[PDB]
Amino acid sequence: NNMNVIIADDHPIVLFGIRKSLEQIEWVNVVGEFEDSTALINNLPKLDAHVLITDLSMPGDKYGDGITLIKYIKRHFPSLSIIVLTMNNNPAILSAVLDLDIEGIVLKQGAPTDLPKALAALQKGKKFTPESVSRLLEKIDKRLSPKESEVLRLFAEGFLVTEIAKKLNRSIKTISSQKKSAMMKLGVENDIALLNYLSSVT
Amino acid sequence: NNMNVIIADDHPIVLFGIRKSLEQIEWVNVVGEFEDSTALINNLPKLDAHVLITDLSMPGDKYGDGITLIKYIKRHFPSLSIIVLTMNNNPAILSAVLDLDIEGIVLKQGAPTDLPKALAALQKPESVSRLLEKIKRLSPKESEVLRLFAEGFLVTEIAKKLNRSIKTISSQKKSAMMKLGVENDIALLNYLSS
DNA sequence: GATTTAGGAAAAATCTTAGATA
DNA sequence: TATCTAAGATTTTTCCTAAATC
Fold first, then answer.
1. Do A166 and A72 belong together in one domain?
2. Where are the 4-aspartylphosphate modifications (chain A)?
3. Is B109 in contact with A195 (Cβ distance < 8 A)?
4. Which of B24, B59, B64, B161 could form a disulfide linkage to B36, CB 3.0–4.6 angstroms apart?
5. CA-CA distance, A64 to A66, in Å (whole number)?
6. Do B31 and B13 fall within a single domain?
7. Are residues B3 and B27 in contact, defined by beta-carbon separation less than 8 angstroms?
8. Phi, psi of A75, deg, nearest 5
9. Pick from B35, B111, B183: which is nearest to A12 by CB?
10. How many secondary structure helices (H) and strands (E) does chain B include?
């Protein structure tokens, strides 16, 4: 019935915001606020807590951030239910976080009543998906072929398409075709978006 | 004597946060919260308001965002004092924003008290703008074009948004890269995240 | 039976340059 | 002096479409 929450976000003004917005829900209890991964993981065993609410990227270098951070948490506190609350509009990175079996994603964009919804579905033992989230996942075997991986690696290294083409003794259109379809598979629409995925799981 | 604030940020959870933290200060009045540039500029004349508190980037395509958006505001409501509350430790982009002559910056990182400080200095030359200044500088368009790019927008798309030619925007991006001593798009973005 | 490879067509982004601004 | 703008020819990349490969 009653609920124990830990909030982790590196923007203190946001942390304040989540605390104040969660303060409203009388079956929720804020039990720790944390600003880095390290303070978080150190105090995790100390608070019996049901729910962790985190952003992806934050400071904290021994335990990391993003996927890594969580994966560590699911591994070591499997009892603990994580909601990711992110600014991240990237379909692929969100998609990777959903392959982790977490209990929620909630974008920081247009989601005033989303969090309470996300948390309320956690009592029910159900998942919530913001309309905003599923919209972001509309683009989406999504696993990529060996050439596709190569072409992508080289690209994520700084190499240009025409340069990749020279290196692998293949046509520019071949390499572009390869990159382009990798991006299709990954549900990612532009180079900025691709590179950001490419450093998320890396 | 009393103070009227308009808050504009696209994260509603954050908007809530700022409203609740400002709610504490009895000589401050939240008079409008806004989530895009267009709703903001449309309601600007409707609220006699002293202070706009904004992030850089938000939706709103008639009037844009960031520098452009600000500059539009200082042009049309020069009475209005803007505090920018932003979420990036990019030195270059911030550099351009501090050359803008607004009446406050506050980073979203580590600044629970900074916002009422910023507002309180406005009662009584800029302290807040002084505060992290120490920490090859790029031109206002150059910063914008770069920001927008690093936001995921394509050169062609940037061009559409700003009602300017693709060659203008490319020329701007390219020279920003030159200023920054960076060779290619991969290299630029990687800088842009430090 | 999907991946690997490209052709021409096409569009997107850069290398010029150059007037204008301020 | 540095910055804002964009036409002009050029380069890079993608769109569309289709062949051999494995």
1. no
2. 55
3. no
4. B59
5. 7
6. yes
7. yes
8. -65, -50
9. B111
10. 10, 5
Q: Do A158 and B184 touch (CB under 8 A)?
A: yes
| B119 and B85 belong to one structural domain | yes
CATH number of the domain that residue B174 is part of: 1.10.10.10
Sign of CA dihedral A7, A9, A14, A15: positive
Q: A110 and A173 share a domain?
A: no
What was the experiment behind these coordinates? Answer: X-ray
Q: Report the alpha-carbon distance of residue B131 to residue B134 in Å, rounded.
A: 8
For chains A and B, what is the number of CB pairs under 8 angstroms? 82
A192 close to A183: Cβ distance less than 8 angstroms: no
Q: What is the CATH number of the domain that holds A127?
A: 3.40.50.2300
A106: β partners: A85
How many distinct structural domains can be found in chain B? 2
Containing structural domain, residue B160: 140-193
CA dist A26 and A22 (Å) reads: 9
Q: Is the domain of B80 the same as that of B155?
A: no
| Domain end call among A136, A166, A187 | A136
Q: How far apart are CA B58 and CA B38, in angstroms?
A: 10
Q: Is A180 part of any domain?
A: yes
One domain for residues A125 and A166: no
Are both B102 and B149 inside the same structural domain?
Answer: no
What residues contact A156, with CB distance under 8 A and at least 6 apart?
A194, A195, A198, A199, B186
CA B156 to CA B77: how far, in whole Å? 31
Alpha helices in B25-165 (DSSP H): 37-43, 66-76, 91-98, 114-123, 127-131, 140-150, 155-161
Q: Rounded to an integer, what distance in angstroms lies between the CA atom of residue B50 and that of residue B29? A: 10
Closest residue in A to B23 (Cα–Cα): A20
Do the Cβ atoms of A78 and A44 come closer than 8 Å? no
**Domain assignment present for A38:** yes
Q: How far apart are CA B190 and CA A202, in angstroms?
A: 15
Place of tokens 């609740």: B20
Between the CA of residue A188 and those of A8, A62, A65, B192, what are the distances in Å? 27, 30, 22, 20
Interfacial residues of B (vs A; Cβ cutoff 8 Å): 10-14, 16-18, 20-21, 35, 85, 87, 108-112, 115, 149-154, 183-187, 189
Are β-strands B3-8 and A81-86 bridged in parallel, bridged antiparallel, or unpaired? unpaired
